[PDB]
């Protein structure tokens, strides 16, 4: 905890991230072969021979066809959802998940984690630098509610204002600037010690890291990155940020009475490129998401 | 120390000695204990002329059985090969001869083990690295048999083939990922 | 008869230095003497020219022409030789670079017109060439906006001189 | 009427190569949810339709065996059975065609 400009903080954070990723890649010495199997439906019995801790499941979908690259959003390594750009470890059996599948609930949760994380990325770089922004967390709300939510403490100077429609449309236009550049959701699975050594300043991030490290016995939390943003989340993400097509932040709401300081919950709604809606239905969904989502218990 | 029942090992030695007897009965003035040096340098410059892609010297160094077995899959690739160091002095392990009278020929096959270290770096036809590594003396031991047609009056000693033991360690892996496709179905059901 | 498109797969480049880019793989393949006219085959070759190989197969599986099955066979076996022989590692990661059609050797017949008159009916044949290059398909050249038009016009006006004098 | 001059290759290339004559890219195409064999929207998948027509052909061959000659065409519903698969009580009067296979996992 010290005085730091907001840019040298992201410099030291993504430099430490790149150092840990280089160490993760360098720990394995050679090219080890793993035999990932395809236990899906369409092309059964296919067995790839991959490079261990190098090859992604996107690099397994590239072997088959281009449609496995276009429409597959999450992998399913043996029982567990694996994000499409995470290097495989052991000899496994794999299966790809799409948006128009029969039971897409896991990939819906993954999509809304990724959209809430994008909203945090677009909130944290839009405010005045003399004001302080502390990204608290994104609580895992179910997708049956209309919007994804992200929790942010604003400045002590700003316990009185609320944004008009122009600031919200500025937020969505910056989020569309984020969407228009096709960026990879890069993951990295780090120990709790290195992860706590990354952040070091946001005490809200510190207790969230401790909460996610307390539940597994190895103390490993899931870090992710879009470009130069680094955030904590539970579970996997979607591959690219260009999968989102219709994006919007709806409103903000203040939830005071549980705490002295004021936490502001930013809300917004999204839809992928394969599941886009007509303008009328989209305005209906945009209209519902202004109401406050409260599903935490 | 020797194991139990050493007499059958001496019987293998007897079979090797009666084959040496047959090669000497055909062609005398043939020393035995300098043939590992001939074997080693034949092996080495055979692989060097494979590196230079010069078939006309390979034909007098290696035989018609292993010329496609060493030249076929390398036709558009480029091999960079280098014998760096002899680890252990080579040894003759089996001498045999066959009396196949189909056209009055007899062949004498010398099996000789060799334990050494080489480098190997196989590239692609576009010049991309494919299999090996440039400057590392990775060690391998190989049992290679030689062969000279005795009845032919010119008859060099050419490398015939190499026998791979079943307990051999698997070779170093490929640099590229590989897809093995499953059963390609007609309208049917996949049963496995 | 000249067959040089077949021999282009036998080029072997020197081994690349470590401080160099990748040099993507190049695969030439062709099918000679197809019983199909070279213009109608050219329309399909112009359809493919820039697309990726999976998109090319997708467009050619649903195009209702005689040459579509032929070019689908050629592209499938070129994909197979690219993965097997020329050391492309990903089956999907190939785009069509060149795609064209040439005249093949034709025969001649009589057509038996309706008096004691006749024409020379010609039994048409053609070729199909294709060249694959590994890598993602290149982005299309975007149409020039008004900024580029204005910049080129001002560059033109800045370029002019006082002609026919010192 | 006859041509008065030979059309050159420039005029011909301007005619036979414009976008009104080129082949239009279609984008109706996606993978089939079962069997992944690249159907078109608004069109049944040819692989799945080939499956169904092969099984229908074998059922029709067994029907043609059971009906003897032509002009027979019974006045009862029919129903097909695979190996195992005892007739249900609701399929009492219905004609029973049993070929020999396991029941495939799309025909229920
Ligand atoms: Mg007449
Ligand atoms: Zn289908």
Swiss-Prot record, chain A:
Tissue specificity field: Isoform 1 is ubiquitously expressed. Isoform 2 is heart-specific.
Domain TGS: 32-98
Bilayer-spanning residue ranges: none
InterPro entries listed in its UniProt record: Beta-grasp_dom_sf, Pro-tRNA_synthetase, TGS, TGS-like, Thr/Ala-tRNA-synth_IIc_edit
One GO CC term on file: mitochondrial ribosome
Principal location listed in the UniProt entry: mitochondrion
Record's subcellular location: Mitochondrion
One of the protein's GO biological processes: mitochondrial translation
Record keywords, A-Z: Acetylation, Leigh syndrome, Mitochondrion, Primary mitochondrial disease, Ribonucleoprotein, Ribosomal protein
Consequence the record notes for mutating residue 268 to V: In COXPD59; uncertain significance
Organism superkingdom: Eukaryota
Protein family membership: Belongs to the mitochondrion-specific ribosomal protein mL39 family.
Disease: Combined oxidative phosphorylation deficiency 59: An autosomal recessive mitochondrial disease presenting with multisystem manifestations of variable severity. The disease spectrum ranges from lethal infantile Leigh syndrome to a milder disorder characterized by hypertrophic cardiomyopathy, lactic acidosis, attention deficit-hyperactivity disorder, and survival into adulthood.
Name of this protein: Large ribosomal subunit protein mL39
UniProt source species: Homo sapiens
Swiss-Prot record, chain B:
Presence of the UniProt keyword Mitochondrion in the record: yes
Transit peptide listed as a keyword: yes
GO molecular function: RNA binding; structural constituent of ribosome
Gene Ontology terms describing biological process: mitochondrial translation
Tree of life domain: Eukaryota
Disulfide bond annotation, renumbered to this chain: none
One Gene Ontology CC term in the entry: mitochondrial large ribosomal subunit
Keywords assigned by UniProt, alphabetized: Mitochondrion, Ribonucleoprotein, Ribosomal protein, Transit peptide
Broad class of the protein's primary localization: mitochondrion
Compartments it resides in: Mitochondrion
Task of the protein: Component of the mitochondrial large ribosomal subunit (mt-LSU). Within the mitochondrial ribosomes, required to direct the nascent polypeptide toward the tunnel exit and position the exit at a distance from the membrane surface.
Family membership: Belongs to the mitochondrion-specific ribosomal protein mL45 family.
Quaternary data: Component of the mitochondrial large ribosomal subunit (mt-LSU). Mature mammalian 55S mitochondrial ribosomes consist of a small (28S) and a large (39S) subunit. The 28S small subunit contains a 12S ribosomal RNA (12S mt-rRNA) and 30 different proteins. The 39S large subunit contains a 16S rRNA (16S mt-rRNA), a copy of mitochondrial valine transfer RNA (mt-tRNA(Val)), which plays an integral structural role, and 52 different proteins.
Protein name: Large ribosomal subunit protein mL45
Organism: Homo sapiens
Gene: MRPL45
Residues of the full protein shown: 103 to 294 of 306
From Swiss-Prot, chain D:
Protein family according to the UniProt entry: Belongs to the bacterial ribosomal protein bL32 family.
Primary subcellular site in the record, as a coarse category: mitochondrion
Keyword annotations of the record: Mitochondrion, Ribonucleoprotein, Ribosomal protein, Transit peptide
Native source organism of the sequence: Homo sapiens
Post-translational modification: MRPL32 precursor is processed by the m-AAA protease (composed of AFG3L2 and SPG7), which cleaves the N-terminal transit peptide. Cleavage by the m-AAA protease takes place prior to assembly into the large subunit, an essential step for mitochondrial ribosome (mitoribosome) assembly. Proper processing by the m-AAA protease is dependent on the zinc-binding region within the tightly folded C-terminal domain of MRPL32: zinc-dependent folding halts degradation initiated from the N-terminus and triggers the release of mature MRPL32.
Protein's gene: MRPL32
Positions bound to Zn(2+): 32, 35, 45, 48
GO molecular function list: RNA binding; structural constituent of ribosome
Any single GO BP term: translation
Spans annotated as Disordered: 86-108
Keyword Transit peptide tagged: yes
Purpose: Component of the mitochondrial large ribosomal subunit (mt-LSU). The mitochondrial ribosome (mitoribosome) is a large ribonucleoprotein complex responsible for the synthesis of proteins inside mitochondria.
Cellular compartments annotated: Mitochondrion
GO CC terms: mitochondrial inner membrane; mitochondrial large ribosomal subunit; mitochondrial matrix; mitochondrial ribosome; mitochondrion
The organism's taxonomic lineage, starting at the top: Eukaryota, Metazoa, Chordata, Craniata, Vertebrata
Subunit-structure text: Component of the mitochondrial large ribosomal subunit (mt-LSU). Mature mammalian 55S mitochondrial ribosomes consist of a small (28S) and a large (39S) subunit. The 28S small subunit contains a 12S ribosomal RNA (12S mt-rRNA) and 30 different proteins. The 39S large subunit contains a 16S rRNA (16S mt-rRNA), a copy of mitochondrial valine transfer RNA (mt-tRNA(Val)), which plays an integral structural role, and 52 different proteins. bL32m has a zinc binding site.
Boundaries of the shown chain within the full protein: 79 to 186 of 188
Annotated Basic and acidic residues bias: 91-103
Domain of life: Eukaryota
């Amino acid at each position: 905890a010290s005085q730091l400009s907001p840019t040298e903080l992201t410099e030291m954070r993504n430099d430490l991230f790149n150092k840990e990723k280089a160490r993760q890649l360098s720990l394995t010495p050679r090219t080890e072969k793993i035999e990932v199997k395809h236990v899906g439906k369409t092309d059964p019995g296919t067995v790839f021979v991959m490079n261990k801790n190098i090859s992604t499941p996107y690099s397994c979908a590239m072997h088959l066809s281009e449609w496995y690259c276009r429409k597959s959003i999450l992998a399913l390594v043996d029982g567990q959802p694996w994000d499409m750009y995470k290097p495989l470890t052991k000899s496994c059996e794999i299966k790809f998940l799409t948006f128009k599948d029969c039971d897409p609930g896991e990939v819906n949760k993954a999509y809304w984690r990724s959209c809430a994380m994008m909203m945090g990325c677009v909130i944290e770089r839009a405010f005045k630098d003399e004001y302080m922004v502390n990204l608290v967390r994104a609580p895992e709300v179910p997708v049956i509610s209309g919007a994804f939510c992200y929790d942010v403490v604003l400045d002590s100077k700003l316990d009185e204002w609320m944004p008009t429609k122009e600031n919200l449309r500025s937020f969505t236009k910056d989020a569309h600037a984020l969407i228009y550049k096709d960026l990879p959701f890069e993951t990295l699975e780090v120990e709790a010690k290195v992860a706590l050594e990354i952040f070091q300043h946001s005490k809200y991030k510190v207790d969230f890291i401790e909460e996610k490290a307390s539940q597994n016995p190895e103390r490993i939390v899931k870090l992710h990155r879009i470009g130069d943003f680094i955030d904590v989340s539970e579970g996997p993400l979607i591959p690219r940020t260009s999968i989102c097509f219709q994006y919007e932040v709806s409103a903000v709401h203040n939830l005071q009475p549980t705490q002295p300081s004021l936490i502001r919950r930013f809300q917004g709604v999204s839809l992928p490129v394969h599941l886009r809606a007509h303008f009328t239905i989209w305005d209906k969904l945009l209209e519902r998401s202004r109401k406050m989502v409260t599903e935490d218990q | 120390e020797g194991l139990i029942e050493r007499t059958e090992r001496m019987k293998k030695t007897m079979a090797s000695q009666v084959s040496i007897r047959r090669i000497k009965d055909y062609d005398a003035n043939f020393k035995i204990k300098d043939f590992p040096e001939k074997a080693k340098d034949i092996f080495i410059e055979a692989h060097l002329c494979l590196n230079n892609s010069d078939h006309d010297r390979l034909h007098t160094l290696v035989t018609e059985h292993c010329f496609p077995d060493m030249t076929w899959d390398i036709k558009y690739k480029t091999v960079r090969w280098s014998f760096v160091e002899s680890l252990e002095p080579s040894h003759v392990v089996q001498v045999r001869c066959s009396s196949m009278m189909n056209q009055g020929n007899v062949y004498g096959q010398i099996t000789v083990r060799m334990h050494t270290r080489q480098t190997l770096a196989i590239y692609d036809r576009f010049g991309r690295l494919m299999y090996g590594q440039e400057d590392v003396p990775k060690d391998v031991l190989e049992y290679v048999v030689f062969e000279k047609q005795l009845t032919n009056p010119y008859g060099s000693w050419r490398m015939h083939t190499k026998i791979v033991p079943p307990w051999a360690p698997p070779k170093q892996p490929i640099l590229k990922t590989v897809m093995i496709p499953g059963p390609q179905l007609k309208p049917e059901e996949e049963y496995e | 008869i000249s067959r040089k498109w077949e021999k282009k797969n036998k080029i072997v480049y020197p081994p690349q230095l470590p401080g160099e880019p990748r040099r993507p793989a190049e695969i030439y393949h062709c099918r000679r003497q197809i019983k199909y006219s070279k213009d109608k085959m050219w329309y399909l070759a112009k359809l493919i020219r820039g697309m990726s190989i999976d998109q090319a197969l997708a467009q050619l599986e649903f195009n209702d022409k005689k040459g579509a099955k032929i070019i689908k066979e050629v592209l499938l076996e070129a994909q197979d030789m690219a993965v097997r022989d020329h050391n492309v590692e990903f089956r999907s990661n190939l785009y069509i670079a060149e795609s064209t059609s040439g005249r093949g050797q034709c025969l001649k017949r009589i057509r038996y017109h309706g008096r004691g008159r006749f024409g020379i009916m010609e039994k048409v044949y053609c070729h199909y060439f294709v060249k694959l290059v590994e890598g993602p398909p290149p982005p299309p050249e975007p149409p020039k906006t008004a900024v580029a038009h204005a910049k080129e016009y001002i560059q033109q006006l800045r370029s002019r001189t006082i002609v026919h004098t010192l | 009427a006859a041509p008065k001059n030979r059309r050159t290759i420039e005029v011909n290339r301007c005619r036979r190569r414009n976008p009104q004559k080129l082949i239009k890219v279609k984008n109706n195409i996606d993978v089939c949810p079962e069997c992944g064999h690249l159907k078109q929207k608004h069109v049944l998948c040819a692989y799945c339709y080939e499956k169904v027509c092969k099984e229908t052909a074998e059922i029709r061959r067994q029907i043609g065996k059971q009906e003897g000659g032509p002009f027979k065409a019974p006045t009862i519903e029919t129903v097909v059975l695979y190996t195992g698969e005892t007739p249900s009580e609701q399929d009492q009067g219905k004609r029973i065609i049993e070929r020999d296979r396991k029941r495939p996992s799309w025909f229920t």
